[PDB]
Design a protein around this nucleic acid. Structure first.
Ligand SMILES: Nc1nc2c(ncn2[C@H]2C[C@H](O)[C@@H](COP(=O)(O)OP(=O)(O)OP(=O)(O)O)O2)c(=O)[nH]1
Length: 848
DNA sequence: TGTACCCCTGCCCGCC
């Protein structure tokens, strides 16, 4: 009747007011975009009186000063007992502050914040004087992520949205308890570009728009869901005219609508109009955030498009004057309103760790198990300004790419997972989709603390885990790997480490503090971490009884995502730029960790058990058993003995290795025993740290390492197994020298963290030279890029891009000398070093 | 206005 109900998704700050973008059900319950403009929000300032003065003394003093300063008729202010438990010195654990409410929008001095160090005769500190509008709203009104909102007193008369409402009382908006959510209008994008040798900038040739008007995150997303619409927007690449027969052939072979334009300006103008109309909640894509959104923005800026703001939901008539590495924030604000669901950004990458480059094709293969052979489209080639079939081919590649981005997006549950994490943290959905962890920690703490009458802080360096020196070599007996479930998170709870409970010297953050006595009640941090580990426990419970393989994978991501979250809770204690940075606390967590790992080793030593290796939270035990169950007895026995030492913290049997080959620290190969339904036990090769597992080692090298390990660890006569390996390698030598191997098996990946320019000794680095050639060719390469290349027949002077090599026309052949020495010999030598009766010279001979 | 979990351990490259 009078209660206006909106489901918020994103926000934006403007003119000292807060704006929420969301979805609304009308009388027929149909869902449309809406934009609320919340006014009358205030900052909760807290003045701290000196020893001898009281909140009353302060009020008498500043309330008139502030009224004059900001020209206010009246200012709400009351005394309030608040607790401080953070790194500042000279702040009492609890005091009577004068809580003052200073509206963000004031008649005068609207943006003159009160400095926290402001001193006076009555007070000496002032908390919460710089807090940001969004924070103040979400905290005061207890909003915990994307949720339904009851908004009373909605003014409709006083954006690219259907509805536009404004409220003058923040108190009017209140969260509902409804856990169901609207359907989301998703619009996947795919943009093809070409570089201009004139200005050295990237221009847009085509854009594909795959709409999915009803995506419900309540129920699961059906696989391969077909879009409710598909539309491509093509521009000429070289000349102003396409090739005769493009339209006809397009509607004959290409899926969905295809509309041709005369120049770019026109194409983008249509694109913007289309966004405004479709008005989607989420924008799917691959490398949107870090490449294509940036390009799109600059082009619209250069071509002087008026409807550029269409990308977002806020109507901007003018471009941010500072536009032209701040483009990050700028673009995020312009997109304010529509969630950017990039599957290849940090958030996406964290859900798909099995990838080495996160190329769209690789991501498709990994997450969907479907193979797609990518096509290198270079619109610089006149092949596309003349041949018509080439053009239709490129467009088709772009359609498939857009479709793949969307599918993978739904497959990895990017939207469902991020939303849930956002509701857990109480921050914004967009921010979580960006791939933040400091933000989700910051906000979960902001809420938990504020809810319990705590003052929140205004807006290597220590020793880590313990890693034992391994018993480097092979262990033919059954080995046990005992692991501590969520070591650090569990430690926090065990010894009750928290901002509120741990005594620490705030004059020296490098001074190790000490666990609090059992008398002290459980703090904030252990409580939240408690809930986190509970959630991961429940998800791993469901994963153990899931029939579908696809759903089980989907659960594995979910549990290691909640794992990342809880671990991040700890990390942010040691994150210098964390709002809740507490070096001493982190220090203490790692400390008790090491202590516990020692005690775990010693406990085994006393039982005359062999501790062959350990890393942070695990220990490996050579039991001297020839069978599984006999080791398992010693395992469960040792388990019972350590669990008695701790209240919450508990060790368990992680894996069992029929045979273990320790190479170094953090590197080893072993044979895991996996039990089946009918008690059947099988063997699987597990590897850690070894060269084969790195991206700088080609697929050939990987296969070689895997075979060598399989036979070496296989129950075969030691000298006979060695023989089998030598022979295998003699054969590989011939295959590589003659060139009887597919070039794809030679490919090497290496991510440049810096720009290829910022590499002084880059002349030696092959990946750098390759990135330089790529850029010259017109390919977008930048910090974070992953470069795939091959050494052909100085090493760096002979390294070329993979795609350039797979072009027979270029006649590029891999250098067998390099790959035999570095890619095959080096790793196998490191694989077999500590193995009995291994001969290094015999190996060197078998190759060169 | 303006982001970004922690530390541990090897392998390149160069130099003292
Ligand atoms: N800050 C931070 N700490 C981590 C991270 N990964 C691991 N750690 C630390 C904290 C963990 O408690 C400890 C154990 O690491 P593990 O990889 O074995 O996973 P964890 O023990 O947390 O869970 P699990 O054994 O799989 O049940 O190492 C991380 O990504 N960030």
């Amino acid at each position: 009747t009078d209660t206006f109900q909106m489901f918020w998704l994103d926000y934006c700050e403007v003119n000292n007011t807060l704006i929420l973008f969301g979805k609304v059900k009308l009388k027929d319950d149909n869902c449309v975009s809406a934009m609320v403009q919340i006014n009358g929000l205030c900052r909760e300032l807290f003045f701290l009186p000196r020893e001898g003065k009281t909140p009353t003394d302060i009020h008498e003093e500043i309330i008139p000063l502030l009224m004059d300063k900001y020209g206010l008729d009246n200012i709400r202010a009351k005394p309030q007992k608040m607790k401080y438990s953070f790194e500042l010195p000279d702040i009492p654990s609890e005091s009577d502050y004068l809580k003052v409410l200073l509206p963000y929008q004031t008649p005068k001095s609207s943006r003159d914040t009160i400095p926290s160090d402001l001193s006076s005769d009555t007070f000496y500190h002032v908390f919460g004087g710089n807090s940001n509008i969004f924070e103040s709203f979400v905290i005061q009104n207890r909003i915990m992520g994307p949720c339904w909102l009851d908004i009373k007193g909605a003014d409709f008369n006083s954006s690219h949205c259907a509805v536009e409402v404004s409220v003058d009382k923040p108190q009017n908006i209140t969260p509902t308890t409804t856990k169901t959510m609207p359907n989301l209008r998703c619009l996947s994008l795919s943009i093809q570009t070409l570089m201009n040798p004139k200005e050295n900038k990237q221009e847009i040739v085509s854009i594909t728009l795959s709409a999915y008007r009803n995506i419900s995150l309540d129920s699961p997303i059906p696989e391969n869901i077909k879009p409710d619409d598909l539309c491509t927007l093509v521009r000429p690449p070289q000349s102003t005219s396409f090739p005769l027969g493009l339209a006809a052939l397009a509607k004959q072979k290409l899926p969905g609508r295809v509309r041709l334009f005369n120049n770019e300006k026109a194409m983008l103008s249509c694109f913007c109009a289309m966004l405004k109309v479709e008005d989607p909640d989420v924008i799917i894509g691959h490398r949107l955030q870090n490449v294509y959104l940036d390009v799109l923005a600059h082009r619209m800026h250069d071509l002087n498009i008026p409807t550029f703001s269409s990308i977002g939901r806020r109507l901007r008539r003018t471009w941010p004057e500072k536009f032209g590495n701040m483009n990050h924030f700028f673009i995020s604000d312009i997109c304010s309103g529509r969630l950017i669901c990039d599957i290849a950004n940090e958030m996406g990458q964290s859900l798909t760790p099995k990838c080495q480059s996160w190329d769209l094709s690789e991501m498709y293969q990994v997450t969907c198990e479907k193979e797609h052979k990518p096509l290198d489209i270079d619109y610089q080639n006149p092949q596309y300004q003349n041949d018509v079939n080439s053009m239709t081919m490129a467009l088709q590649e772009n359609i498939t790419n857009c479709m793949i981005s969307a599918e993978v997006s739904y497959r990895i549950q990017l939207l469902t997972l991020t939303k849930q994490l956002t509701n857990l943290a109480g921050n914004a959905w967009a921010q979580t989709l960006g791939g933040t962890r400091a933000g989700r920690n910051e906000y979960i703490l902001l809420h938990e603390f504020s809810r319990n009458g705590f003052i929140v802080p205004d807006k290597a360096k220590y020793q880590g885990g313990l890693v034992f020196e391994p018993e480097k070599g092979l262990h033919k007996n059954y080995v046990l790997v005992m692991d501590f479930n969520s070591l650090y998170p569990s430690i926090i709870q065990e010894f009750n480490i928290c901002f509120t409970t741990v005594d620490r010297n705030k004059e020296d953050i490098d001074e190790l503090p000490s666990v609090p006595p059992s008398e002290v009640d459980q703090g904030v941090l252990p409580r939240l971490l408690a809930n986190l580990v509970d959630r991961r426990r429940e998800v791993k419970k469901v994963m153990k009884t899931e029939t579908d393989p696809h759903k089980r994978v989907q659960c594995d991501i979910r549990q290691q995502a909640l794992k990342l979250t809880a671990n991040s809770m700890y990390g942010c204690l040691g994150y210098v730029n964390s709002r809740f940075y507490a070096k001493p606390l982190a220090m203490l967590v790692t400390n008790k960790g090491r202590e516990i790992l020692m005690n775990t080793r010693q406990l085994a030593e006393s039982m005359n058990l062999l501790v062959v290796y350990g890393d942070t939270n695990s220990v490996m035990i050579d039991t001297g058993c020839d069978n599984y169950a006999d080791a398992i007895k010693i395992g469960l026995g040792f388990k019972r003995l350590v669990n008695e030492r701790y209240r919450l913290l508990e060790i368990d049997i992680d894996n069992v290795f029929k045979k273990l080959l320790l190479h170094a620290k953090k590197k080893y190969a072993a044979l895991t025993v996996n039990l089946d339904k009918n008690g059947n036990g099988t063997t699987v090769l597990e590897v850690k740290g070894l060269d084969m597992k790195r991206r700088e080692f080609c697929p050939l090298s990987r296969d070689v390492s895997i075979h060598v390990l399989n036979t070496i660890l296989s129950d075969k006569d030691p000298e006979e197994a060695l023989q089998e390996v030598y022979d295998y390698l003699e054969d590989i030598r011939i295959k590589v020298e003659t060139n009887n191997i597919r070039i794809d098996k030679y490919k090497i990946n290496m991510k440049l963290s810096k720009d290829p320019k910022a590499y002084p000794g880059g002349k030696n680095m092959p990946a750098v030279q390759v990135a330089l050639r790529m850029r010259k060719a017109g390919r977008v390469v930048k910090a974070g890029s992953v470069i795939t290349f091959v050494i052909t027949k100085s090493v760096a002077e002979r390294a070329h891009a993979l795609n350039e090599v797979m072009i027979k026309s270029n006649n590029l052949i891999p250098d067998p000398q390099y790959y035999l020495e570095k890619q095959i010999f080096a790793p196998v030598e490191r694989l077999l070093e500590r193995i009995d009766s291994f001969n290094v010279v015999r190996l060197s001979e078998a190759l060169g």
